[PDB]
């Protein structure tokens, strides 16, 4: 449990090259730096990347490990921007509260593992409530591992509102881990 601190780099090019940026400190604006994300990589933990600068538009969470091409993170855009630092779920591996309707409303599930397709395994095609959050957390649009990803930064949450979304409407998701 070192966390002593997540370091990525943006490289406007592939195979690392043209202008690379490196920083283990929240980047939020660190477009000003690179406008095309080719390849990235990560040096420690896990890293945070939003879809536009300020915006934190179209959310996307980088993994651990090296990204020698966009298509080595399976890039949903090629924008990469505003990006906080990641530090994977520790203690009581990643725990979830997923819920049918809104004010605990509705079929409640207490999972704590990773889910290709929240309907396809809970049947809740949108969560009006969500409880619980880990360290951090990853949401998916679509089931298996597809769709846009989105930062966790919600908890007992009742409302589906609470998400960002104006609606529920979820698929799948994946938990984080060393």
Same mark, same amino acid.
Not at 2 to 16: C, R, V
Not at 79 to 91: E, I, Y
Not at 146 to 168: C, H, N, V
């Given at each position: ?11 406007? =090019? ?7 940026? =490196?920083?283990?400190? =929240? ?10 994300? %080719? ?19 179209? *959310?996307?969470?980088?993994? /651990? ?5 966009? /298509?080595?993170? *399976?890039?949903? %855009? ?14 009581? /591996? ?15 599930? #207490? ?8 309907? #396809?395994?809970?049947?809740?095609? #949108? ?10 957390? $990853? ?16 908890? #007992?949450?009742?409302?589906? $509102? ?17």
């Amino acid at each position: 449990m070192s966390k002593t601190g997540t370091k990525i780099t943006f490289y406007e =090019d592939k195979n690392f090259q043209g202008r690379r940026y =490196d920083c283990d400190c =929240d980047c939020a604006d660190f477009h000003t730096y690179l406008s095309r994300c %080719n390849s990235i990589k990560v040096e420690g933990g896990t890293w945070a990347v939003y879809e536009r600068p300020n915006f934190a538009w179209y *959310m996307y969470i980088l993994p /651990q490990g090296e990204y020698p091409e966009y /298509q080595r993170w *399976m890039g949903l %855009n090629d924008r990469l921007s505003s990006c906080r630092a990641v530090h994977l779920p520790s203690g009581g /591996q990643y725990k979830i509260q997923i819920f049918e309707k809104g004010d605990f409303s509705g079929q409640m599930y #207490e999972t704590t593992e990773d889910c290709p397709s929240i309907m #396809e395994q809970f049947h809740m095609r #949108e969560i009006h409530s969500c409880k619980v959050l880990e360290g951090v957390w $990853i949401f998916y649009e679509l089931p298996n591992y597809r769709g846009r990803q989105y930062l966790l930064d919600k908890k #007992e949450y009742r409302k589906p $509102i609470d998400w960002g979304a104006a609606s529920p409407a979820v698929q799948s998701f994946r938990r984080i881990v060393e």
